[PDB]
Amino acid sequence: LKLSDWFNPFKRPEVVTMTKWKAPVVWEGTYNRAVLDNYYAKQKITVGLTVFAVGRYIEHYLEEFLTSANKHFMVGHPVIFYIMVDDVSRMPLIELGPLRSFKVFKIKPEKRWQDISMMRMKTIGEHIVAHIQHEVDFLFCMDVDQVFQDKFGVETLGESVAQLQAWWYKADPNDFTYERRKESAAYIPFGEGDFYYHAAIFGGTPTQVLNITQECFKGILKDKKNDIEAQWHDQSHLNKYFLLNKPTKILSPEYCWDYHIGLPADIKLVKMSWQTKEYNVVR
Ligand SMILES: O=c1ccn([C@@H]2O[C@H](COP(=O)(O)OP(=O)(O)O[C@H]3O[C@H](CO)[C@H](O)[C@H](O)[C@H]3O)[C@@H](O)[C@H]2O)c(=O)[nH]1
Ligand SMILES: [Mn+2]
Ligand SMILES: [Mn+2]
């Protein structure tokens, strides 16, 4: 498969469509999903999707996330949803459609929400080694407080996939909220950086995602050891990781949009949107 076989950057001249290391940035209008569905279907791929719901997030977001995923995620290809919750008795079983199935695991609820978010890196890694590596060809790891709004398909697959954070995609690197303290493993010096990635969505082959999570958790552990916590937790470490190990594909903010921003000309068709945000329950 050649990049030119399914990707035409000339359809979106007003946004960044190719990185300096030749990785494509996928925006609505640049991909030929029909070509990709055929190619991947012929290889009979299976895609995994992990999602964590702890505490109030279960009743507030899990059902909406799973229902929408079942409807819009990798339609036409086998998908396995890996659900991690602290209380399985509340795991909202919904009806899944053709080619979708699931596997639920009960996890420990971390006291601090910051740790609930960060420990995912450890847990995902353990699961990739234990079984996911044998079950799927590609894997995505996502925040639960989001909803699929339209088709999120095979055009998003790749060795290592990153998401452009909706609020900073047009900002210059020196303005990114990377971790700036040299004392943290997530430290990124001013004068460095390609894009500001969103930890709400990342993926790739099981091998690559294993390295992403393992390296991120190592930094998370190193920081705890030195009594320091990155301001943006796992997102900060993920950004450090992606700086050192460039993603082979990046998804535009259309794949992870926050309507609080509005709806600028660049956002042509939203595939997934941030949930309200909260402000009351959840935590
Ligand atoms: O009480 C909680 C808290 C967190 N989470 C899990 O952790 C994820 C990330 O936390 P939030 O959604 O609450 O936080 P943000 O929206 O701020 O997330 C952003 O910041 C985080 C660190 O602050 C991570 O980097 C995350 O991937 C990124 O999208 C949630 O989707 C959820 O799956 C829970 O289940 N229950
Ligand atoms: Mn979130
Ligand atoms: Mn918002």
UniProtKB/Swiss-Prot annotation:
Catalytic activity: a beta-D-galactosyl-(1->4)-N-acetyl-beta-D-glucosaminyl derivative + UDP-alpha-D-galactose = an alpha-D-galactosyl-(1->3)-beta-D-galactosyl-(1->4)-N-acetyl-beta-D-glucosaminyl derivative + UDP + H(+)
Keywords: Glycoprotein, Glycosyltransferase, Golgi apparatus, Manganese, Membrane, Metal-binding, Signal-anchor, Transferase, Transmembrane, Transmembrane helix
UniProt remark on cofactor binding: Binds 1 Mn(2+) ion per subunit.
Residues that, per the record, bind substrate: 52-57, 143-145, 165-168, 177, 277-283
One GO CC term on file: Golgi cisterna membrane
Membrane topology reported for the UniProt record: Single-pass type II membrane protein
Residues that carry a glycan: N211
Family to which the UniProt record says this protein belongs: Belongs to the glycosyltransferase 6 family.
Protein name: N-acetyllactosaminide alpha-1,3-galactosyltransferase
Gene name for this UniProt entry: GGTA1
